[PDB]
Design a protein around this ligand. Structure first.
Ligand SMILES: Nc1ncnc2c1ncn2[C@@H]1O[C@H](COP(=O)(O)OP(=O)(O)O)[C@@H](O)[C@H]1O
Ligand SMILES: Nc1ncnc2c1ncn2[C@@H]1O[C@H](COP(=O)(O)OP(=O)(O)O)[C@@H](O)[C@H]1O
Ligand SMILES: Nc1ncnc2c1ncn2[C@@H]1O[C@H](COP(=O)(O)OP(=O)(O)O)[C@@H](O)[C@H]1O
Lengths: 441, 459, 38, 362, 449
């Protein structure tokens, strides 16, 4: 599916000089902000700096999310990129502080390296002994390559896996002795015909070759929050996915912080600091900000990127207004990146990119009109008309979106400004702020 | 056992029972009176494009606002969309009131409904043998093992369905299931080929007379083929996959079993579960074994959402797998529910309002009211004189569309209790006097409640 | 050597599959499925 | 460079210098920790602090070869109640002389005037009366009466002895002519008779089955079942006990705190029961059909906070040994397997343990 | 390796006479406050007084948090330093005064010598013996297990209690395993397979372990560091026994509970016995409540009781507020945001704003700590922002400017790189002007108010 930021596929900057290109990777304009963001990527990728809070500020639209989403695309898969809407911090399960602590620790990765041994071979024989009316199980697996054959004892856990997988002679299987996962890969020869209900036919494979065992390094990245959850419990690691973690006690996290440092010095773990993107941060309250002040001071703090639309605005949980809706002793810790409203030549480029992403073929006149609509009504509204006009054009079986299709879309769907006028022009027939309304004609 | 009710099975009727669709040409132009709609031609034409947007499955997380006064047909238009899409497309309607759960943060409630609105269709083959067990019979092996009393090479089972008989030459290992399931001759079972095990459905009711007393429920013989291989289509919302992962159902241990016996509170599911679900779902879509069905989340009275709800929907709508969200509002210029000093149009925050395609619904002309009266009358089955249609429509113009429509059922009763099947002005004139409207009743409050000491309204 | 009195053995190979039952279990309820109950 | 373990020891030694600015013994033990911290205080199987009484062994020599290990573990928080309260009718629910209310109230509120007793239910079983639904919820009057009186643990054990037969009907009663057949006595059991899970168990490609397993598959794929525990509780205690000088109090401690039926449910059938169940002429059911204790989430830590040292730590706990290991894993290309010299004899023994861990020959 | 806001602070930088060196241990200035924090350090190390309060009072950025971190380093790792913000007190699980007591008791340490009395060996034989319960309804029960343990030096046969056999069942022990049985808990740990069975031909990654050296029966001496809070928690939600309550307590969701003062006074007596037995020593430490203005009138009222406790820690409060409204007491205003009543209990250490030359010196220390090289023109330019805008702001420029410098290939930051950093990364006040200037107009491009 196509979404609001699907065209954004990077930050669009020269990796050498960090110079923003005027158009690249789906981003247009905002060059100062895109350059400032490119520098923050270097701080993230180097990882040495802890707890720098960057605020992207600007009026609505202007790409504050688009830039932050461009950064996510530039960091790639290994680095954590936790996105919070600030409204997620308010919870009934846990305090706001606990919700912030978890989100901070979600943004720090721990890249564990482990070495595992996998078997692979043709099953030549399988033998299982089962107790009558009881759990006791034992068995032996005879397994083969073109160059080895050996008989392995099976425990109860293997026998459960072996029957879940319906391992039969001639199956090619591999077994990771560390995890105990069994996978079938095919068969060395046809499934025998005498028995019925023998299941779906497999792939063919030639027999595996060389040694049965081989060692294999495997790398797993987990957040510090996952480690918190696993170690706060004997049982219930489902809480990692379910929420339901409660307010994890701080003496557990102290221990985890020490152990992760120990794992790092031992070379067991590589710590991978990522970013917490908080969107619409002006939704946090005064207690949240007082916590974040000092969460940033840890050497395990991620870099925290924030976005706000707000002018001078009231701080939540507070009597008084402040710039961005953020308190001043918080803003003392924060550098601000400013986004700016677009030029018509930028809107034309952005709309062209949206049209390509949505696979919509605008005529040049339709693009000109959409650009003009974009100046009067906003970039989002004009981008919605692209999809609408495509549909309307298709119903009349036109090859391309014409001005006629854009005009009809504009006719059908109200500009956020026209809707405000419509609301004013029917103040008596809409329900007021004091609840009065008239239903009569 | 159950005594079948044979007489009648007629439908009830509710406020929207007449709405049957958007009533649009093949060109998408609205007909002035079709599918139960009268007027709103522009609003119906816009909703027609919305139906085409949804049915095209191209786009995620587009917002639509239905804006207009109370009674102007906004929920009628939403219900018409749901009918235009048909039941294959998910449609999750809520009010903004429904978000304030006591069990979880309201943004979890919003995200739950958000993923109810996304359907997944999965096609798989089901492949089982079924019947009553006619026979069970070992075959000795030709090479019996040393030191063992018996060696069995096959275990024959005869299965009978209503449509055939088959001898299953099963692998000997099925002895395990037969013992543990206690399969007898005459029990109804199935054997599934992906495991080779069996499960006992019950004892066949062909044996319900074996004893005067037995602790058996008897079950009919399967009325399918003895071997059932067919493709099966499974429809699940992505919310069903969330819950199936966050609250696994089948657990055999004491803690699982105590769990399923206690109150099953919902839980604030993590983004990493939902994200991990999304990524595997997308694997199967690329394999072509599943298809995504993006539906509609309809939020009625969206002015009841607060600013924390709206700021979350910003994030939610940006996700690649998201429904179309349709809001409806009627609140003019109003305070945002969570931000007591911000007033905005529709009661929707201006930050969020910029996202929405806005569709206005206008008031109705007197002649549209009269047409609706007749459509509503023929839906409630009320028969009217034309003078009664006029008198009712006059209340529609002077008072409210809803009020005049509501008099038809009272007036129908007052007519038949005078032996008349056709309602006439004399009946309308009695319904309207037994059943006041909001304004005439409010005039009594002003006049009789002019004082409160006794016999006055509490104020 | 003698097999465990309580364990039934399944074994599968290129020739297919057999189950073998201790003579201590024939004449029990476990023998019935093998045609050798009480 | 020193490992963090060595660094901590070396620091604690230079704390001694605050007295001294024994230095010969100090520098000799500085030399030990710089060789390996196990020369100074060898790492060992360890556990949280235990905050409880237990009976310790006073003599190893007199213990002999055969000894009975009783369960001595006891709380140091030791709540002392008079038997007037704890035994002789200061507990309202327990009948006896001087608690004449409790025996009456037990009978009347749980049996006589109890809506769930089968004689009471059967009067209300019809029409619009309050147990009218019971006809269709797949439970007997006996089972309704049991579920109202047993606690959620006891009910959960009984629930182990049950079969998902309504889910199997979904597999079998499938064609339009089966009319989604459901036992009329199970009519209201709607969500059990139809849900996707049962079908997904049975399809030949487990697409909907895999989708429902993602969370637990991902958990194990990350290895979080096998990763070392990064934390544990620093102290651990047994439950607080009442101390009351009565034999009844001691009996009651065994009945509740070491509750036999709960334990039997958790750990399952005994070996004799498995024999009697297996050699009999007819099948027989077992009180729990299986052990109902869950599988532990951690495959190695299981249900205990005991931790065992490992050879991986052993190598890295000495900076020299870690460095030596890296160069030995290339000098193996040259040989020199025993071209190593030591100023301490015990260091040679530790090196045998390391070499055998590496399987390097002498 | 990773560098945070306070990575340069290493200590209070005091002489043995207790006088602040004007620049030492990462500090510049605050000399009077560093000297007062020195006396606080000596109050803590004396471990003689309970329940003394200290307020670090002073504007934001004046090093109050640096000083508290310096106290923690002067005390070193033996002493509990328990740092919190006032925002952390607002648990959903338990009342706010509960998390005050938990944190008060995390600040009190205990070092204790523990004897582990333990059995070890390869399991050579294992044989259950059974009770024929007639009418319990649960069927038979195992009455004891007989188990043979073998070490390198000797051998025993143990007749285990049923509750210890349940521990072995949980641990999945089999003949030929090496196991550990702590008689303190009755816990059992499976160490591995005996090395006598060491073979490649098992599908599961078994731990093949050597036979235990020495006697089968041992006593181990271990020195443990615990806090009073760890003892409280251990005894509130018990998990150490092999009884059924402990067993099920390991399966239920972890949950904080409003631990009673009865449990706390009982655990004082337990710890007092360890002290009188000579196995323990008390290590009373310090609780640092940062952002203490975020506490509320109920918290401050509770501290008036809690600080009277004869084992209360030392409490250091920081506040950055002038005359401000007390939270939860909206009619009451007082200095520091602290009630006048509770302020009488504290010793207030005021901290003061920096001079231009101190700021210049902090820039160099901080530049050295982040590992970045500046020209003196660069150091002067950054110091100007510290004077004109804010210390915090000017220190935030060092990391951006280093990248911008390196991007041009120059390894040393010069004025052009700071001049670029100033324009990419605004301070609060340049951003606030953009808000106000644009906020002249609404419409599409207005900031939302
Ligand atoms: N400079 C830009 N280049 C490309 N797309 C942009 C740009 N700015 C905004 N957009 C797009 O327009 C929409 C609005 O921008 P968004 O980033 O959501 O604004 P906000 O700053 O309010 O979060 C998004 O779909 C985004 O992809
Ligand atoms: N165009 C229309 N044609 C037929 N019936 C309508 C029309 N508009 C509204 N109604 C009916 O009149 C009533 C008011 O419409 P409704 O959708 O409830 O208004 P709203 O949602 O704006 O409050 C409903 O019973 C509805 O079915
Ligand atoms: N005297 C000082 N010497 C060196 N660095 C200091 C000094 N005072 C403050 N800092 C540093 O300046 C920043 C602000 O000080 P901080 O303690 O956070 O102020 P606050 O009183 O608001 O806590 C921190 O990075 C801190 O390390």
């Amino acid at each position: 599916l196509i979404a609001a930021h699907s065209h954004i596929r990077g930050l669009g900057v020269d990796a050498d000089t960090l110079e923003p290109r005027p158009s690249s990777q789906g981003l247009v304009g905002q060059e100062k902000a895109r350059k400032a963001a490119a520098v923050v990527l270097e701080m993230i990728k180097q990882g040495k700096i802890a707890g720098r809070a960057v605020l992207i500020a600007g009026p609505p639209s202007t790409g504050k999310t688009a830039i932050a989403m461009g950064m996510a695309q530039s960091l790639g898969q290994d680095v954590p990129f936790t996105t919070l809407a600030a409204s997620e911090i308010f919870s009934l399960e846990m305090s706001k502080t606990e919700a912030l602590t978890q989100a901070f620790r979600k943004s720090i990765g721990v890249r564990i390296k482990e070495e595992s041994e996998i078997m692979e071979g043709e099953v030549v024989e399988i033998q299982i002994d089962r107790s009558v009316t009881g759990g006791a199980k034992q068995g032996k697996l005879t397994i083969k390559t073109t160059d080895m054959e050996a008989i392995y004892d099976m425990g109860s856990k293997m026998i459960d896996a072996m029957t879940k997988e319906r391992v039969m002679a001639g199956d090619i299987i591999s077994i990771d002795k560390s995890s105990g996962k069994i996978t079938k890969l095919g068969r060395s020869y046809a499934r025998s015909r005498d028995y019925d209900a023998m299941g779906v036919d497999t792939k063919f494979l030639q027999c595996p070759e060389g040694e049965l065992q081989k060692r294999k390094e495997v790398v797993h990245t987990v957040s510090l929050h996952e480690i918190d959850v696993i170690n706060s419990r004997t049982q219930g690691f489902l809480a990692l996915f379910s929420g339901d973690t409660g307010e994890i006690r701080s003496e557990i996290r102290d221990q985890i912080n020490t152990k992760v440092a120990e794992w790092k010095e031992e070379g067991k773990a590589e710590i991978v600091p990522g970013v917490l993107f908080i969107d619409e941060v002006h939704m946090l309250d005064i207690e949240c900000f007082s916590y974040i002040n000092r969460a940033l001071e840890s050497d395990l703090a991620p870099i925290v990127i924030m976005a706000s639309n707000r002018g001078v605005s009231r701080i939540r949980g507070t009597d008084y207004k402040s710039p961005h809706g953020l308190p001043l002793d918080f803003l003392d810790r924060v550098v601000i990146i400013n986004t700016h409203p677009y030029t018509p030549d930028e809107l034309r480029q952005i709309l062209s990119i949206r049209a390509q992403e949505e696979e919509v073929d605008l005529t040049p006149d339709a693009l000109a009109l959409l650009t003009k609509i974009g100046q009067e009504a906003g970039l989002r509204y004009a981008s919605n008309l692209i999809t609408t006009s495509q549909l309307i054009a298709a119903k009349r079986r036109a090859k391309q979106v014409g001005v006629e299709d854009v005009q009809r879309s504009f006719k059908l769907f109200y500009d956020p400004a026209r809707s405000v006028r419509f609301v004013q022009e029917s103040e008596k027939r809409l329900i007021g702020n004091d609840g009065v309304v008239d239903f009569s004609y | 056992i159950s005594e079948v009710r044979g007489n009648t099975r007629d439908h009830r009727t509710a406020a929207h029972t007449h709405i049957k669709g958007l009533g649009l040409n093949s060109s998408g132009i609205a007909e002035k009176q079709a599918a139960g709609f009268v007027g709103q031609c522009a609003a119906r034409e816009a909703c027609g494009v919305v139906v085409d947007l949804i049915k095209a499955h191209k786009m995620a997380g587009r917002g639509v606002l239905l804006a207009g006064g109370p009674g102007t047909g906004k929920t009628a238009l939403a219900l018409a969309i749901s009918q235009e899409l048909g039941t294959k497309i998910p449609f999750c309607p809520i009010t903004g009131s429904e978000i304030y759960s006591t069990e979880v943060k309201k943004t979890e409630v919003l995200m739950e409904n958000f993923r109810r609105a996304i359907g997944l269709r999965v096609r798989e083959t089901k492949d089982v043998y079924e019947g009553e067990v006619t026979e069970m019979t070992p075959e000795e092996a030709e090479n019996p093992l040393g030191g063992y009393g018996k060696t069995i090479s096959t275990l024959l089972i005869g299965l009978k369905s209503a449509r055939g008989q088959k001898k299953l030459r099963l692998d000997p290992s099925i002895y395990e299931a037969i013992q543990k399931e206690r399969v007898q001759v005459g029990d109804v079972i199935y054997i599934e080929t992906n495991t080779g095990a069996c499960k006992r459905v019950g004892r066949s009711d062909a044996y319900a007379t074996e004893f005067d007393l037995e602790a058996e429920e008897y079950v009919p013989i399967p009325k399918g083929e003895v071997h059932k291989k067919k493709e099966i289509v499974q429809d699940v919302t992505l919310h069903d996959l969330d819950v199936a992962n966050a609250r696994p159902q089948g657990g055999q241990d004491i803690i699982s079993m105590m769990g399923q016996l206690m109150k099953p509170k919902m839980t604030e599911i993590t983004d990493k579960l939902r994200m991990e679900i999304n990524k595997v779902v997308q694997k199967y879509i690329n394999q072509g074994v599943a298809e995504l069905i993006p539906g509609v989340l309809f939020i009625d009275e969206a002015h009841m959402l607060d600013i924390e709800c709206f700021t979350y929907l910003n994030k939610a709508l940006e996700s690649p797998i998201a429904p179309i969200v349709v809001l409806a509002s009627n609140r003019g210029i109003a305070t945002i529910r969570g931000a007591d000093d911000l007033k905005a149009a529709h009661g929707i925050p201006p930050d969020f309002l910029q996202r929405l395609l806005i569709i206005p619904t206008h008031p109705y002309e007197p002649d549209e009211i009269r047409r609706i009266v007749r459509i509503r009358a023929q839906t409630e089955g009320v028969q009217l004189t034309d003078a009664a249609v006029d008198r009712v429509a006059e209340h529609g113009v002077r008072i409210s569309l809803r009020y005049c429509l509501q008099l038809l059922a009272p007036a129908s009763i007052l007519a038949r209790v005078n032996g008349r099947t056709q309602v006439d002005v004399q009946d309308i004139a009695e319904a309207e006097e037994l059943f006041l409207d909001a304004r005439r009743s409010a005039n009594i409050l002003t006049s009789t409640g002019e004082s409160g000491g006794l016999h006055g309204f509490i104020s | 050597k003698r097999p465990d009195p309580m364990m039934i053995r399944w074994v599968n190979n290129k020739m297919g599959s057999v189950v073998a039952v201790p003579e201590e279990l024939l004449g029990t309820h476990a023998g019935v499925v093998f045609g050798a109950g009480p | 460079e020193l490992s963090y373990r060595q660094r901590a020891m070396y620091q604690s030694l230079r704390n001694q210098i605050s007295i001294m600015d024994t230095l010969m013994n100090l520098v000799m033990q500085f030399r030990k920790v710089c060789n390996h911290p196990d020369l100074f205080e060898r790492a060992d199987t360890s556990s949280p602090f235990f905050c409880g009484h237990f009976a310790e062994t006073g003599s190893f020599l007199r213990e002999g070869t055969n000894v009975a290990l009783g369960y001595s573990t006891r709380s140091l928080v030791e709540y002392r109640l008079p038997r007037l309260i704890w035994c002789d009718g200061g507990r309202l629910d327990k009948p006896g002389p001087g608690n004449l209310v409790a025996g009456f109230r037990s009978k009347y509120l749980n049996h006589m005037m109890n809506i769930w007793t089968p004689e009471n239910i059967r009067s209300s079983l019809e029409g619009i009366e309050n147990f009218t639904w019971l006809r269709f919820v797949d439970t007997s009057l006996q089972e309704a009466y049991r579920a109202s009186h047993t606690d959620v643990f006891a009910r959960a054990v009984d629930l182990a002895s049950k079969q998902n037969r309504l889910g199997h009907m979904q597999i079998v009663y499938d064609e339009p002519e089966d009319k989604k057949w459901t036992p009329v006595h199970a009519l209201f059991q709607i969500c059990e008779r139809e849900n996707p899970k049962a079908v997904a168990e049975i399809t030949t490609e487990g697409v909907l089955r895999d989708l429902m397993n993602i969370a637990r598959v991902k958990y194990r794929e990350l290895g979080l079942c096998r990763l070392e525990k990064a934390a544990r509780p620093r102290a651990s205690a047994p439950p607080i006990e009442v101390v009351c000088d009565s034999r009844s109090a001691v009996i009651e401690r065994e009945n509740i705190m070491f509750h036999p039926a709960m334990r039997k449910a958790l750990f399952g059938p005994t070996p004799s029961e498995i024999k009697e169940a297996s050699f009999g002429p007819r099948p027989v059911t077992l009180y729990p059909p299986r052990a109902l204790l869950p599988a532990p989430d951690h495959d190695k830590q299981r249900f205990t906070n005991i931790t065992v040292p490992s050879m991986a730590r052993f190598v890295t706990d000495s900076g020299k040994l870690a460095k030596l290991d890296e160069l030995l894993r290339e000098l193996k290309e040259g040989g020199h397997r025993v071209l190593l010299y030591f100023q301490m004899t015990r260091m040679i023994d530790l090196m045998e343990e390391y070499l055998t861990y590496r399987n390097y020959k002498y």
